[PDB]
Design a protein around this nucleic acid. Structure first.
Ligand SMILES: [Mg+2]
Ligand SMILES: [Mg+2]
Ligand SMILES: [Mg+2]
Ligand SMILES: [Mg+2]
Ligand SMILES: [Mg+2]
Ligand SMILES: [Mg+2]
Ligand SMILES: [Mg+2]
Ligand SMILES: [Mg+2]
Ligand SMILES: [Mg+2]
Ligand SMILES: [Mg+2]
Ligand SMILES: [Mg+2]
Ligand SMILES: [Mg+2]
Ligand SMILES: [Mg+2]
Ligand SMILES: [Mg+2]
Ligand SMILES: [Mg+2]
Ligand SMILES: [Mg+2]
Ligand SMILES: [Mg+2]
Ligand SMILES: [Mg+2]
Ligand SMILES: [Mg+2]
Ligand SMILES: [Mg+2]
Ligand SMILES: [Mg+2]
Ligand SMILES: [Mg+2]
Ligand SMILES: [Mg+2]
Ligand SMILES: [Mg+2]
Ligand SMILES: [Mg+2]
Ligand SMILES: [Mg+2]
Ligand SMILES: [Mg+2]
Ligand SMILES: [Mg+2]
Ligand SMILES: [Mg+2]
Ligand SMILES: [Mg+2]
Ligand SMILES: [Mg+2]
Ligand SMILES: [Mg+2]
Ligand SMILES: [Mg+2]
Ligand SMILES: [Mg+2]
Ligand SMILES: [Mg+2]
Ligand SMILES: [Mg+2]
Ligand SMILES: [Mg+2]
Ligand SMILES: [Mg+2]
Ligand SMILES: [Mg+2]
Ligand SMILES: [Mg+2]
Ligand SMILES: [Mg+2]
Ligand SMILES: [Mg+2]
Ligand SMILES: [Mg+2]
Ligand SMILES: [Mg+2]
Ligand SMILES: [Mg+2]
Ligand SMILES: [Mg+2]
Ligand SMILES: [Mg+2]
Ligand SMILES: [Mg+2]
Ligand SMILES: [Mg+2]
Ligand SMILES: [Mg+2]
Ligand SMILES: [Mg+2]
Ligand SMILES: [Mg+2]
Ligand SMILES: [Mg+2]
Ligand SMILES: [Mg+2]
Ligand SMILES: [Mg+2]
Ligand SMILES: [Mg+2]
Ligand SMILES: [Mg+2]
Ligand SMILES: [Mg+2]
Ligand SMILES: [Zn+2]
Lengths: 58, 105, 205, 159
RNA sequence: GGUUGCGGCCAUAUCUACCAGAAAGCACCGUUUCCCGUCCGAUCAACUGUAGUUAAGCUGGUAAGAGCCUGACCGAGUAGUGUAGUGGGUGACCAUACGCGAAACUCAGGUGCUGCAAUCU
RNA sequence: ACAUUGUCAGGUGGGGAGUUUGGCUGGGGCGGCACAUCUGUUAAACGAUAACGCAGAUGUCCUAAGGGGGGCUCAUGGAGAACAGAAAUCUCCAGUAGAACAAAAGGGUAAAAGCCCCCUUGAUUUUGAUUUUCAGUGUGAAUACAAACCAUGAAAGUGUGGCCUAUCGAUCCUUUAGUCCCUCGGAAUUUGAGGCUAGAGGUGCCAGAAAAGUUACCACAGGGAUAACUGGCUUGUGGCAGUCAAGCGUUCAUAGCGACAUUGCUUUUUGAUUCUUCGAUGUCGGCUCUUCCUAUCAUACCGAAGCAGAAUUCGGUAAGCG
RNA sequence: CUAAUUAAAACAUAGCAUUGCGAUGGUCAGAAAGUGAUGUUGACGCAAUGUGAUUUCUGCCCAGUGCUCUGAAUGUCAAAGUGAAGAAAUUCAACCAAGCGCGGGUAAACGGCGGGAGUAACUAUGACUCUCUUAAGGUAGCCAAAUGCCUCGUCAUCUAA
RNA sequence: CUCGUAGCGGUUCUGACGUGCAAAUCGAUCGUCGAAUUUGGGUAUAGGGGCGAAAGACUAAUCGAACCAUCUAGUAGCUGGUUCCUGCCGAAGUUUCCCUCAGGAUAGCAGAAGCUCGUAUCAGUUUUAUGAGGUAAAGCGAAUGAUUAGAGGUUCCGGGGUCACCUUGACCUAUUCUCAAACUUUAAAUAUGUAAGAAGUCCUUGUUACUUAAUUGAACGUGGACAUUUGAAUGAAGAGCUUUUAGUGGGCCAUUUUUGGUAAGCAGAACUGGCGAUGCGGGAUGAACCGAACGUAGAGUUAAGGUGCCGGAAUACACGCU
């Protein structure tokens, strides 16, 4: 049969019945997507920071 | 499509591990080689009555096949497989583009 | 044979002119836009009388030609063909479609129309001040050929110009006015002084 | 049929801003982007590599990754009934700093500075911005300015 | 302040015509063994600032210049537009109410600014 | 000691059997593909957005038309050279691109992305991340990296195909490359087979069944989600009116007419909705019989004439009566 | 003959014609059978069809498809059998029956039966003629016919119409 | 062979009847009536079979495949129906894929169960700052493309007219009228992105294999400085998170902007609000309009609409018009 193809009528009512959320950011994002050279050094630049912190407290 | 039959590509040959010279041939399939397991299963399943069991495909639509260049390193004989696009013509030899010459025929 | 002018009377679709997607436009039938003594100077005809549209509509190319014939025929038989300059200030550029059950509905070009705003001038006649009531009745008879409602506005400009009758006078004893073919060129305080001397030399006296 | 390609409907958007065609001027390549900087995405059509999709033209986001010629920018994209984090690899010639964040960061330096002489004396310096408050009392003089206007004008056609 | 090299913004710097430039730099200019490149030392390369010159480049000024740039209660609160009515009108469209608000035009003004280095009667 | 017979193998075999004959659709059929795509418009200045909307293009082409470097400026116009002119080559001036970039269109590009020359294969290997279509799946295309290995250039750099936006494909099976790696289950050797990682061979109805017709003898489940007859809306067309009056009507626009225009009326003609009806509103014409409308053929009474009379023609009241 | 909506022009028919078959057979049954029908038969028979009394005739086509042929014998040719290599499973090669392909015959087999142009001492008409394709290009006859859209063709007749 | 009885058939009345006398009769009118006649009994042929002077006819009122039982409660994306009350919450007719389009899956909308916590973090809104857009309008003596009309400029660009001429075409320069969904220098309104801080700013300097000529930068830190006017307005109804699941996936209307169409109670879009799913007051009447959304009552006041009479409410007041 002939049918109504497409409409976006009533689509923003459903989009706001459950209240659109911004994506809930965090401190310390994932290092996926970073330049792998920078992440590789950052493993060591934070390992040695912990060694210089844990030995200095004890 | 004109492709040179000698190439300088990377070799994963565990001794080169660098760009070496490669002799280039076009890849053809090779024979069906009965005693392949799906062929032996095809033989035991077509026997008897009820005729054809597996589908027999008909509505082919491609005018072309992608050409696969079947390379070979000149040093360690480690072969590669490169793939190009669909083309109605694939020329493996020479006959490079001479630019300033008069047309004919 | 032709659909009546009530069918395409109101502007319901966008401007659809002749270009590289239409390519089959049937040509208009008004092809003369200046009438009377068009080669009279600016000074011969100081009195501009206008036909102005009070309605937003489409004037058809048939209707603009028919009103042109009727208005030209009245003015020549009263004062002669060199007593006025009737300028049709409206050009039919809008192409109308026609479909000929509802399937494949997109149309093929039918006729030419001319979209006119409320307040837009249709006709303009410049003439002498003595020939004023002749021109009005020549335009008053041209109302009947048009749908909608049209007004006869006595302009305050001098002829076919964009400056009033006394403003044109103070520019005329002064030397900022000189003849062209159909119109009059004006002097500016701008550009090179040598070109202000080449043309317009009665000034700077 | 219908066409939904990558640069579809981008006829005027990726255009090159009249009498400013040609090469990219060198201040674009001398700008410095750090992670956390807030950047406006405006695609330069004369550079076809690293070019953002048409959804992100005019969007503003935060640099997260820095590579050789490209910043990684995070944009929030409304997809259905929520926003999704979009991570874009754009070269730095489609990217400029958001001038609002330069205007913010000076106000942070200003509010630090204004609170300093709030610590010398007179605490609660009232450093928050306020809207346009209603006007105060005036006394309008008339010396040389006697009030005069006439009436509405009549109807003239003035053609 | 001039000039040179490297620039930033990229015509207020562009274009057209005419006129000036002290010093300095820059330029034109002299030669072709070498390095180098050409049909050809015009380009390019190489050499000496030696034979000469501001003619050009180049800088600056002039122009009721063209263009470009800025401002205007200049158009104009205009065209358009958001919102409202059991407003008007047969309709086309229009008027009002609460807001937002141009562009073309027109006048006035202008015609590169500046960074780093180096040198200059 | 051949037919015959038993078994197997090739043919013949709609005589007989079973199954197949896509979808979108201003009803279905037909045509077409809007079925997988790209550019501009539709599309109403973020994005998204339909129609069998519109104007075009896709299933290719390329070892250069890919990568890098250097040099140069293109369309065209003006003036100049024997043949030679309007177009052969040569030389200068002007040239913001009016040219070219494989192919549609849009965008981009002037010491280049174009034209000429030199060198090359990065159109390479490996694993992730990302963008678009999006379920934030897949496929295709693309962007930025990173480990290599090369190209290239003096170098800074640039190159993971084509300046960018399209040019394409799952499981199963077959095949090839790689390791010479895993297993063949009593233990081995050798073939042979199976396995892992990466491609190929293809499904265009393009997320992908293996399939010719007709039915008026048809049948079943439904469907006014759907064609015809009616009613209703709309009104291209058909008819009937009106305004204006260039002209026709011996002179004289309007007695009677009337072009080019223009404004309406009808649903009885013919066209558009599939609104209602498929658990059926009995489908044309005729006959019979009643009533209604008036847009009046006649009859009654009038007005006009290019009405002398007779006969006509135009118009009014009027559906009483034929 | 459609019992119970179609009695007909449909079916049959004699006549005509075609085809197959000499019995170890034709045509057909049956699951098979030491089994059947025709058949208690024998070409003046049996079986398979087509047309449908009589008069008078049955034109042209074998290119298609079917049917048929003591017809051509390295084109294709399955299984079995033969040979080579291999340790062997296997791989290959040669030979290769019917049937297909090749050649021919058959239209009372199925079926088919044409355009453009110019031409006669009329204006066009076209015996004859020039090409395109044929296998043949509708002959004898008949017709707006129960077969012709245009079409209510044109003329005559029938009628007042 | 014929006329015509008995007989055997069944033409026409389209007769009667048509809940009949009758699931095929009755009556009249008819065909044929000595054979291919009519007929009893016996016998043979049986369902994908028979039999057929052929109608898909007949084979026990059954025939384009008899009848009986079983498999079988065969299958159904299709139609009907689906059984008590109250309370609370409460939709969708849209996305993507599917031989998908009367159906599924998937996301969305909805409920339930909660869990971790306790006004954090926010928001269908504004302001301030800062971008993006090329639509409405504007423009065309601005480009591209249309288009109007004269001016001035003299040429084997075939203007005939001499063999430098009233009767030149275009071209160039300055004017002029009119325009553009797939043109544009400009450029709104509405809509739209981001920011307005403790995950902050400042100082000191710790780490690293990244980066720099160089602890230089980069990133993450130690320690220290600043406390709710801690960095606009308004609100906040608790915030955040998880699991699982129903129905839906036919839509329709109105305002505004729209495409096609002459137009439509037409076919298709966008934003919002409705109807569906919804009563109440008004529009006489009506899914959608206006007003307003609903526990059971009482009193008051209103909305939209009204106030001659039906009919609650002024045959009120005022100025005119008809
Ligand atoms: Mg739907
Ligand atoms: Mg597109
Ligand atoms: Mg020299
Ligand atoms: Mg309202
Ligand atoms: Mg647009
Ligand atoms: Mg958009
Ligand atoms: Mg095109
Ligand atoms: Mg294609
Ligand atoms: Mg170069
Ligand atoms: Mg190209
Ligand atoms: Mg193009
Ligand atoms: Mg794709
Ligand atoms: Mg499978
Ligand atoms: Mg074993
Ligand atoms: Mg193997
Ligand atoms: Mg599909
Ligand atoms: Mg029913
Ligand atoms: Mg009457
Ligand atoms: Mg009468
Ligand atoms: Mg009368
Ligand atoms: Mg009456
Ligand atoms: Mg009566
Ligand atoms: Mg009967
Ligand atoms: Mg017997
Ligand atoms: Mg014959
Ligand atoms: Mg064999
Ligand atoms: Mg004949
Ligand atoms: Mg007899
Ligand atoms: Mg008899
Ligand atoms: Mg009898
Ligand atoms: Mg009967
Ligand atoms: Mg009867
Ligand atoms: Mg009874
Ligand atoms: Mg008898
Ligand atoms: Mg008897
Ligand atoms: Mg049978
Ligand atoms: Mg039959
Ligand atoms: Mg039965
Ligand atoms: Mg059942
Ligand atoms: Mg509720
Ligand atoms: Mg799909
Ligand atoms: Mg569905
Ligand atoms: Mg249903
Ligand atoms: Mg819920
Ligand atoms: Mg625009
Ligand atoms: Mg516009
Ligand atoms: Mg539009
Ligand atoms: Mg908008
Ligand atoms: Mg569905
Ligand atoms: Mg449904
Ligand atoms: Mg339209
Ligand atoms: Mg309801
Ligand atoms: Mg109301
Ligand atoms: Mg109500
Ligand atoms: Mg009413
Ligand atoms: Mg009322
Ligand atoms: Mg109570
Ligand atoms: Mg009362
Ligand atoms: Zn190798």
């Amino acid at each position: 049969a002939k049918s109504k193809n497409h409409t976006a009528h009533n689509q923003t009512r459903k989009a706001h019945r459950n209240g659109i959320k911004k994506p809930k950011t965090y401190k310390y994002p994932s290092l996926k997507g970073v330049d792998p050279k920078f992440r590789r050094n950052h493993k060591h630049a934070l390992h040695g920071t912990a060694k210089a912190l844990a030995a200095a407290k004890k | 499509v004109n492709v040179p039959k000698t190439r300088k590509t990377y070799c994963k040959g565990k001794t080169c591990r660098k760009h070496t010279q490669h002799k280039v041939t076009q890849y053809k399939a090779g024979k069906a080689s009965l005693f392949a397991q799906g062929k032996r299963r095809y033989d035991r399943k077509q026997s008897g009555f009820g005729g054809q069991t597996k589908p027999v495909f008909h509505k082919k639509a491609k005018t072309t096949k992608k050409v696969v260049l079947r390379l070979e390193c000149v040093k360690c004989k480690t072969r590669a497989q490169l793939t190009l696009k669909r083309c109605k013509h694939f020329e493996l030899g020479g006959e490079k583009k001479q630019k300033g010459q008069a047309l004919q025929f | 044979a032709r659909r009546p002018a009530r069918c395409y009377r109101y502007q319901k679709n966008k401007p659809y002119p002749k270009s590289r997607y239409n390519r089959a436009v049937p040509d208009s039938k008004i092809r003369i836009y200046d009438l009377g003594k068009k080669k009279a100077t600016v000074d011969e005809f100081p009195l501009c009388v206008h036909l102005v549209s009070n309605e937003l509509e489409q004037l058809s190319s048939e209707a603009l030609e028919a009103a042109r014939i009727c208005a030209n025929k009245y003015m020549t038989t009263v004062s002669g063909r060199d007593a006025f300059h009737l300028r049709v200030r409206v050009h039919p550029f809008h192409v109308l479609r026609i479909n000929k059950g509802m399937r494949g509905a997109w149309g093929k070009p039918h006729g030419l129309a001319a979209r006119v705003d409320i307040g837009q001038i249709i006709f303009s006649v410049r003439t002498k001040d003595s020939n004023k009531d002749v021109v009005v009745e020549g335009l008053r008879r041209a109302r009947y050929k048009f749908p909608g409602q049209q007004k006869i506005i006595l302009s305050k400009k001098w002829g076919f110009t964009n400056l009033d009758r006394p403003e044109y006078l103070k520019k005329r004893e002064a030397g900022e006015v000189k003849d062209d073919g159909a119109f009059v060129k004006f002097l500016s305080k701008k550009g090179s002084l040598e070109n202000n001397i080449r043309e317009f030399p009665e000034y700077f006296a | 049929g219908k066409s939904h390609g990558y640069r579809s409907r981008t006829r005027y958007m990726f255009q090159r801003d009249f009498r400013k065609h040609g090469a990219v001027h060198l201040s674009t390549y001398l700008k410095v982007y750090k992670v956390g900087d807030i950047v406006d995405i405006k695609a330069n059509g004369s550079i076809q590599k690293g070019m953002p999709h048409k959804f992100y033209q005019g969007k503003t986001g935060v640099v997260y990754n820095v590579t050789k010629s490209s910043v990684g920018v995070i944009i929030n994209k409304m997809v259905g009934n929520r926003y999704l984090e979009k991570r874009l690899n754009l070269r730095v010639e489609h990217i400029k700093h958001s001038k609002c964040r330069q205007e913010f960061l000076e106000r942070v330096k200003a509010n630090a500075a204004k609170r300093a002489e709030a610590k010398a004396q007179g605490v609660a310096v009232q450093l928050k911005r306020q809207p346009a408050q209603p006007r105060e009392s005036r006394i309008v003089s008339t010396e040389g300015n006697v009030p005069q206007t006439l009436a509405p004008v009549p109807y003239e056609t003035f053609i």
